[PDB]
Design a protein around this nucleic acid. Structure first.
Lengths: 54, 502
DNA sequence: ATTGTAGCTGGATGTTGAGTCA
DNA sequence: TTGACTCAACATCCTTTGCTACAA
């Protein structure tokens, strides 16, 4: 349930800049409390999300 | 306080936060390996890299099948792989240092402060990667990735291998400082990415690192690529070695590289408990975009044997929570050794001459429960069952324990024509298992299912599904809903839906 | 006012890191 | 340079349907 702006960053970091994960993941999870519960129960959903819009 | 840092143990809140962050980070890394593995398959790139490999060398990569002695074919394969390694050194003309720890493990302290400072980042799009590989420019990770791409161009079944380094959620320290002495040299001592190649003649995956360690090995028990030494494992903790193949397969290949998978590594994996097991399986499935092959069968047989031959660990710590073995002294008070079984091995205790501990296989340990405890699993005792053990309790008391075989599945009586349920002394039905629902009945769970059933004036029974344990001094039954006859389900469901009109 | 309710679980067992020792 | 200790501070598991005093 993310924004257009964040999903763009996340895909770009994951794909070509994984060295930049730490601060991005620090930032994103602090701004999306729900994500925690999402990843834990539905990791596959999160996966396919990232694999999309390419 | 000073006593807080002397402890050097974080809060329980932090524990959980680290566990979640570990997962999130892992998933991202695994997804990165998936995507990067796509890039490697690039058609524009492969037509270019193909030309790096002479005809003579190509033939070595695809030797003739040798009937009398298949080993000779393996030999020729390995020779091809070696020459490929050599001309790749020739191709890769500039190697960069990792700017900041590359994809090696970060400390929690590092992660906390990473959010603190905004660093400039040069973006890397798919095209840049391709251009860098063809021109031969980049850090050691990009190098091996390029290499896997070359082998695939030559139509060899080459996997990209990624050793995933999320931060260690087992590390419960507040202060997570590292030794600066020879920090870089120790970090790069073992690689994060490498290559595996399938050998159809001996039917095994061959391990290939053409960049860092510059070797080719056929792993039996020991691998040159598994990090060794306390220093090295501070930035390289081997726990998730993942293989990505040509056809978009994704396999957890750690078993090959961890000598002590079951004893050491397991402890450090999210997989150490039932939930994490299922959770990890979910991530893998999500990245595994192909059908099973005969090759998978071979590799699984290899893994099954590696598991069989790891055997008992040398040390007491490593036997805490092992999946296969238990120390005599760790058998729970509520467990027994199955009749006719004994130890299956021993442990020499380091520090005491001739001191030895008895080690049991878990398949030979039986779990016992009390009568009440079985009822909580919807089970009663068989006629003329004898208890296997007797144990103390609380304000003592002698509780008897029984084995699963002494138990029977509890089948509750059916509801009457009018829909009447038979209920306990408090006027409720106990339903701790699907089994515990009467055959002609159904369980309806809802905060208002009782209010509903009373309004329809129909025949029901409140359902005690579990017990909330709380402060004061008092246990409490959780009446989470309703048991009604089956034919009254939709009536109940309609009323529930219309609760506001009651 | 003779009912409605505020206030009064732990105890055994496992996990964690520091430190000391042989 | 190793791992088995002990120490102490928590965490987690197993419990599996009250009792007394007093304000209104």
């Amino acid at each position: 349930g993310l924004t257009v702006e964040d999903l763009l960053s996340l895909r770009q970091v994951v794909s070509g800049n994984p060295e930049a994960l730490a601060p991005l993941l620090e930032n994103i999870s602090a701004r999306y409390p729900q994500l925690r519960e999402h990843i834990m129960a539905n990791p596959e959903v999160f996966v396919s999300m990232l694999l999309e819009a390419v | 306080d000073a006593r807080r840092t002397s402890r050097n143990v974080c809060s329980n809140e932090e524990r959980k936060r680290r566990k979640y962050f570990h997962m999130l980070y892992l998933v991202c890394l695994m997804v990165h390996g998936f995507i990067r593995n796509e890039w490697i398959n690039s058609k524009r790139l492969s037509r270019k890299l193909s030309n790096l490999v002479p005809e003579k060398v190509f033939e070595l990569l695809h030797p003739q099948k040798d009937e009398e002695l298949p080993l000779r074919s393996t030999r020729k394969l390995l020779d091809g792989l070696k020459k490929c390694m050599e001309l790749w050194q020739k191709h890769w003309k500039i190697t960069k240092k990792y700017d900041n720890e590359g994809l090696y493990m970060r400390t929690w302290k590092e992660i906390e402060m990473s959010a603190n400072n905004k660093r400039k980042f040069k973006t890397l799009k798919r095209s840049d990667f391709l251009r860098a590989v063809s021109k031969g420019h980049g850090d050691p990770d990009i190098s091996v990735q390029g290499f896997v791409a070359m082998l695939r161009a030559c139509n060899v079944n080459a996997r990209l291998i990624m050793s995933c380094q999320p931060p260690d959620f087992t590390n419960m320290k507040i202060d997570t400082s590292l030794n600066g002495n020879n920090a870089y040299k120790d970090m790069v001592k073992y690689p994060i990415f490498w290559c595996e190649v399938w050998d159809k003649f001996s039917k095994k995956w061959i391990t290939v690192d053409p960049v860092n360690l510059k070797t080719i090995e056929q792993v039996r028990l020991h691998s040159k690529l598994a990090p060794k030494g306390v220093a090295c494992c501070e930035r390289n903790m081997l726990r998730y070695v993942i293989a990505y193949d040509r056809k978009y397969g994704c396999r957890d290949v750690t078993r090959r590289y961890a000598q002590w998978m079951n004893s050491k590594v397991r402890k450090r994996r999210i997989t150490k408990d039932d939930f994490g097991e299922k959770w990890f399986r979910k991530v893998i499935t999500a990245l595994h975009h192909r059908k099973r092959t005969k090759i998978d069968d071979y590799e699984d047989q290899y893994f099954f044997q590696r598991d069989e031959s790891e055997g008992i660990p040398d040390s007491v710590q490593d036997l805490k929570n092992h999946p296969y073995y238990v120390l005599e002294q760790d058998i729970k008070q509520t467990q027994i050794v199955k009749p006719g079984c004994k130890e299956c091995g021993y442990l020499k205790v380091h520090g005491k001459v001739g001191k030895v501990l008895k080690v049991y296989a878990k398949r030979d340990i039986a779990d016992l429960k009390s009568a009440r405890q079985w009822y909580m699993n919807g089970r009663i005792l068989k006629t003329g069952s004898r208890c296997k053990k007797v144990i103390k309790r609380t304000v003592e008391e002698d509780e008897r324990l029984y084995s699963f075989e002494d138990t029977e599945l509890y089948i509750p009586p059916l509801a009457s024509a009018s829909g009447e349920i038979t209920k306990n002394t408090f006027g409720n039905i106990e339903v701790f298992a699907p089994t515990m629902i009467p055959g002609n009945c159904c369980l309806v769970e809802n905060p208002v299912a009782i209010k509903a059933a009373r309004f329809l004036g129909v025949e029901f029974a409140p359902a005690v599904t579990s017990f909330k344990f709380e402060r004061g001094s008092t246990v409490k039954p959780v009446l989470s809903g309703i048991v009604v006859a089956k034919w009254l389900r939709e009536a109940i469901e309609t009323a529930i839906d219309g609760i506001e009109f009651i």
